[PDB]
UniProtKB/Swiss-Prot annotation, chain A:
Disease implication from the record: A chromosomal aberration involving UVRAG has been observed in a patient with heterotaxy (left-right axis malformation). Inversion Inv(11)(q13.5;q25).
Residue runs in coiled coils: 1-50
Biological function: Versatile protein that is involved in regulation of different cellular pathways implicated in membrane trafficking. Involved in regulation of the COPI-dependent retrograde transport from Golgi and the endoplasmic reticulum by associating with the NRZ complex; the function is dependent on its binding to phosphatidylinositol 3-phosphate (PtdIns(3)P). During autophagy acts as a regulatory subunit of the alternative PI3K complex II (PI3KC3-C2) that mediates formation of phosphatidylinositol 3-phosphate and is believed to be involved in maturation of autophagosomes and endocytosis.
Record's protein name: UV radiation resistance-associated gene protein
Localization per record: Late endosome; Lysosome; Cytoplasmic vesicle, Autophagosome; Early endosome
Entry comment describing in which tissues the protein is expressed: Highly expressed in brain, lung, kidney and liver.
Assembly: Component of the PI3K (PI3KC3/PI3K-III/class III phosphatidylinositol 3-kinase) complex II (PI3KC3-C2) in which the core composed of the catalytic subunit PIK3C3, the regulatory subunit PIK3R4 and BECN1 is associated with UVRAG; in the complex interacts directly with BECN1. PI3KC3-C2 can associate with further regulatory subunits such as RUBCN and probably SH3GLB1/Bif-1. Interacts with SH3GLB1; UVRAG bridges the interaction to BECN1 indicative for an association with the PI3K complex PI3KC3-C2. Interacts with RINT1.
Transmembrane segments: none
Curated annotation (Swiss-Prot), chain B:
Range of the intact protein held here: 154 to 204 of 450
Organism: Homo sapiens (Human)
Cysteines engaged in disulfide bonds, as pairs: none
Position of the signal peptide: none
Protein name per Swiss-Prot or TrEMBL: Beclin-1-C 35 kDa
Gene that this polypeptide is encoded by: BECN1
Compartment list: Mitochondrion; Nucleus; Cytoplasm
Length: 50, 51
């Protein structure tokens, strides 16, 4: 029982770490996509001017 | 050698004579307690495995 409990604790810690990492990665991805959208709009405007 | 062994056996019979016989009721109580402990430990182990 004691050895299994130790293993459980280690697994729980690792899962928590991974979940937080996933959340951060998703937020960064959304921000990057929004930036790309705005950049393409600006590029279209510059094309008109040229 | 034979007399020495006889004396050793006398000593061992003395040490046995000093002893008594244990009660069955207390042993039964301990057995029931151990059974309950084993059952609860099994349940805990299954819960840990599922987690």
């Amino acid at each position: 029982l004691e050895r299994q409990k130790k293993a459980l604790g280690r697994e729980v810690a690792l899962l928590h770490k991974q979940q937080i990492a996933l959340q951060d990665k998703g937020s960064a991805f959304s921000a990057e996509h929004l930036k790309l959208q705005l950049q393409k709009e600006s590029l279209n405007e510059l094309r008109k001017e040229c | 050698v034979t007399e020495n062994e006889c004396q050793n056996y006398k000593r061992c019979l003395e040490i046995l004579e000093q002893m008594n016989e244990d009660d069955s009721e207390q042993l039964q109580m301990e057995l029931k307690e151990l059974a309950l402990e084993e059952e609860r430990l099994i349940q805990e182990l299954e819960d840990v495995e599922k987690n």
